[PDB]
Design a protein around this nucleic acid. Structure first.
Lengths: 81, 104, 96, 48, 95, 48, 90, 96
DNA sequence: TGCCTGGAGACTAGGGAGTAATCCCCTTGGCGGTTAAAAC
DNA sequence: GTTTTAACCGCCAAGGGGATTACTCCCTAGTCTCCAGGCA
């Protein structure tokens, strides 16, 4: 597993922008968005892994991600709790 | 045997709310009317959000409420939008909003 | 026949705002999540629900960030979104 | 199944498949109709 | 095979009270359950903090009323307080 | 060149696999008798 | 020239930039609607002034960033509107 | 013999234990929880106080004033993140 | 400086390990197509 | 508009996890009494 940030695809970022209402997109937006998503995922996943490690588990459950997001201030509905 | 929800006239469980308040470590003691008040407030908020969700569902010629309807209901009502400002609804989408300058 | 620039973009804007489906392929995101997590702790297994929750949160975050970026772009009298727009949105949000 | 290798007359299986049907298809690649020579099948197996 | 307490039946009852014809899906019901749990946690925590500030060892109707006033926006808070006081008055009258 | 870099002998490919030795004998016999051989393997690296 | 000197002077200082008595009057006027005959501790009004001035300085910084992004030195009300809209306080 | 001295700390492990008990955090508080909490609080206090004292030394002063604490918090990135949403009375803001 | 309050000193019941069992469920290399999102 | 390729299904193998629910049981907290010293 290496260089997986390229999995966030240019059409995918374009689709997300279109959902956000963007009409025209510069060519340098894709790298910036990849970096921003990398940072956000790093924070959320670190918190979730801490929660899973506290329970002496080896599987990251959806409840752990929900707790991590709630701690970050981004409470998510529909996945329990 | 008559339930406390029946006495209070509510649909949400007063007994369950009382047990949750006692077991949640909020205070040493929990008053008798606290579960009733909390259940009433929860029922009112559920009624508001469900009324708006059902109104959204009827506009789409659909009988069952899907999460998109709940998202539309929450975001279209300013007070509920403020209440659930930092909340993400799974499979909720976003409101249709295209800025005026972008239109031809 | 050839649509003038901007029309297809608005059409797909309307299409992607009508729907609620996830916009990122699930397997690339699953690999990205596993790649990020292996640094913090090795031999970690992700439930499918956990990956779906992460994807939903990330997509919502990116959509809201793109809304802020588009508002930044309309400010300063533009239509295209540029990296400076994302940077300004993030800085005003309190990130970085 | 569209390959018609009737030119050869010997088949050597370097390793064997778990499914004998796949080996049968590999053999039939050369043993099929219209082939004018005796076909010998050689299977190589590592001892123990 | 274990009990999992949820507000599914109560949310369905309230939905039938509001819209007798409409229904609700599993994801929407999960979202509603999460919403009820979140609002319950908010109000309970605010009430606990209010009790702690005033050096009180109990959560009463006053604490939850103040918590609802603090949390909910204007019209929502006013109607919620009205509903709660109606409920508590009826509960005391029924004894 | 010989004093500058040393490559593994191509002979050691056959020396490291008994299948290759037996196949060398079998293929030499088959070419002597005048046949054509199909070699089937499950792995493409084995093909290399 | 004078603007930069003024920036440095107020940037190094820590005293409250808003006058105390007008702010006390404003606080009491705002509180009048919520409840009648309200008394205020002096520490309460000082805390309100500290919070209000910190909030305004942070907002002005975000609006300056918004103005610079528009290739302008002057701050305009649209900058305040965008700062609050992106921050989420709208 | 004091429990704080037994743990080798300066903060009141006994007071922290009483606060954890009286507070409604849990119905049971372990023996090592107050010790750990006191150690963490003492380390954070020592860090912020060292930074504030360095700021005071840089200003040719002998007392830590709120301005020094503000400068210490805002100059250290980790402490700035920890106290990001915190306003310090009579502290001012960083020079720019 | 005069306290309250944190600290020994004895019981005591239960919360939280250990320890099965027990049920659920894929798990992973290398292969071979084959479309529809990407890429150009 | 034209070309690439990578999600994704299928395979073929032998059993292993790895979270859940019941028993037991034993440290370890809580509760109470008394006291002196830490601190406001």
């Amino acid at each position: 597993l290496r260089d997986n940030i390229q999995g966030i695809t240019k059409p995918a970022i374009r689709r997300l922008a279109r959902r956000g209402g963007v009409k025209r997109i510069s060519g340098l937006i894709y790298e910036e968005t990849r970096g921003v998503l990398k940072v956000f995922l790093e924070n959320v996943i670190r918190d979730a892994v801490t929660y899973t490690e506290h329970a002496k588990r080896k599987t990251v459950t959806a409840m752990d991600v929900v707790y991590a997001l709630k701690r970050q201030g981004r409470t998510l509905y529909g996945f329990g709790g | 045997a008559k339930t406390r929800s029946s006495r209070a006239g509510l649909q949400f469980p007063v007994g369950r709310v009382h047990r949750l308040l006692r077991k949640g470590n909020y205070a040493e003691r929990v008053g008798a009317g606290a579960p009733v008040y909390l259940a009433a407030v929860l029922e009112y908020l559920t009624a508001e959000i469900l009324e708006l969700a059902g109104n959204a569902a009827r506009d789409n010629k659909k009988t069952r409420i899907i999460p998109r309807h709940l998202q539309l209901a929450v975001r279209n009502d300013e007070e509920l939008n403020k209440l659930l400002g930092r909340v993400t609804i799974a499979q909720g989408g976003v409101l249709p909003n295209i800025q005026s300058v972008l239109l031809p | 026949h050839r649509y003038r620039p901007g029309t297809v973009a608005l059409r797909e804007i309307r299409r992607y705002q009508k729907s609620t489906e996830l916009l990122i392929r699930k397997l690339p995101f699953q690999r990205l999540v596993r790649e990020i997590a292996q640094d913090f702790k090795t031999d970690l297994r992700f439930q499918s629900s956990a990956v779906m929750a992460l994807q939903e949160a990330s997509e919502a975050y990116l959509v809201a960030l793109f809304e802020d970026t588009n508002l930044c772009a309309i400010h300063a009298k533009r239509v295209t979104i540029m990296p400076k727009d994302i940077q300004l949105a993030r800085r005003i949000r309190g990130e970085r | 199944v569209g390959v018609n290798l009737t030119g050869a007359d010997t088949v050597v299986f370097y390793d064997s498949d778990w499914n004998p049907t796949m080996d049968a298809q590999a053999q039939d690649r050369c043993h099929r109709i219209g082939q004018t020579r005796d076909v010998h099948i050689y299977r190589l197996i590592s001892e123990r | 095979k274990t009990r999992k307490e949820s507000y599914a039946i109560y949310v369905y009852k309230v939905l039938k009270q509001v819209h007798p014809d409409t229904g609700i899906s599993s994801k929407a019901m999960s979202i509603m359950n999460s919403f009820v749990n979140d609002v319950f946690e908010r109000i309970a925590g605010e009430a606990s903090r209010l009790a702690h500030y005033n050096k009180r060892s109990t959560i009463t109707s006053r604490e939850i009323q103040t918590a609802v006033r603090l949390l909910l926006p204007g019209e929502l808070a006013k109607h919620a307080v009205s509903e709660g006081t109606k409920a508590v008055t009826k509960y005391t009258s029924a004894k | 060149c010989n004093m500058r870099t040393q490559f593994p002998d191509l002979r050691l490919i056959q020396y490291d696999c008994g299948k290759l030795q037996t196949l060398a004998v079998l293929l030499r016999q088959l070419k002597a008798e005048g046949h054509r051989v199909l070699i089937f393997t499950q792995m493409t690296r084995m093909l290399d």
